[PDB]
Structures are given as C-alpha cells and as structure tokens.
Amino acid sequence: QAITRSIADQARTIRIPVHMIETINKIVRTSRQMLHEIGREPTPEELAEKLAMPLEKVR
DNA sequence: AAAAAAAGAGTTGACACCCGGGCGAATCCCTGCTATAATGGGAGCTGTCACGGATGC
C-alpha cells in the first residue's frame, strides 16, 4: 500500500487523484480484455455500458 | 417695421437585461484498512588523445 500509494503521487509529474488513476487502470484493463477476447479493438461507446458509466465520463 | 416654434436641453416614468451572490445537489480527494507464507539489484562502458593537474610511499 505504501509503495503503490506513493508511486501514483510523485512519479506522475502532475496532480492525479487515487480514484482517477484507479479508474484509468480499470478502464485500461477492461479495454485490453475486450480487445483480446471480443474483436479487433474496443470502442469507447460500449466501454460506458460495460463499466456502467456515462459517456461523458468515459470520454 | 414685429413675433412664436422644429430642434436643443432636460428630465420623468417604463421596461429589458445581465452578470453576482446565494441555495442546492451532485460529486471529487484523502486517508486508512485489508491478516496463510512471501526476506540483498540491472545497465554501463571497454574502437580519440593530450594536457593538466591531484593524490600515495
């Protein structure tokens, strides 16, 4: 926890909250999984319904 | 020879409105807490000299 909580604050070079970075990681993971087990590339339209988030937020 | 008014000023009410300041509500950032066992690290030159200087017995 100490190594992961501090790596996302100083190494990023810009102020990025923890929830933002965790959402980015989850989105990247789900996008990679969908691109690997669904088709050629996951579109941002279906990423909102897959994660149950608004389109303006995922965009 | 005389003698009053469209403008020119001056206001007086009458809206049209346009950001400001609150009331909300909806939502960001921080911080800590997770209980099987985790126990010393990965590049990098190394195919230029030559000078001019800094350590050692």
Q: Structure solved using which method?
A: cryo-EM
A45 close to A58: Cβ distance less than 8 angstroms: no
Give which of A48, A25, A44 is closest to A35, Cα–Cα: A44
The answer to whether the beta carbon of residue A44 comes closer than 7 angstroms to any atom of strand B is no
Instruction: Report the C-alpha gap between A49 and A6 in whole angstroms.
Output: 32
A56 close to A49: Cβ distance less than 8 angstroms: no
Q: Tokens 């608004």 map to which residue?
A: A54
Instruction: Report the C-alpha gap between A27 and A50 in whole angstroms.
Output: 10
Instruction: Report the C-alpha gap between A25 and A46 in whole angstroms.
Output: 17
Give which of A41, A26, A22 is closest to A12, Cα–Cα: A22
**Measuring from the CA of residue A15 to each C1', which nucleotide is nearest?**
B29
A30, amino acid identity: T
> Coil, strand or helix: which one is A17?
coil
Q: Output Rg (C-alpha) for chain A, integer angstroms.
A: 14
Resolution number, Å: 3.7
A29 close to A21: Cβ distance less than 8 angstroms: no
CA of A53 to C1' of B56 (A): 73
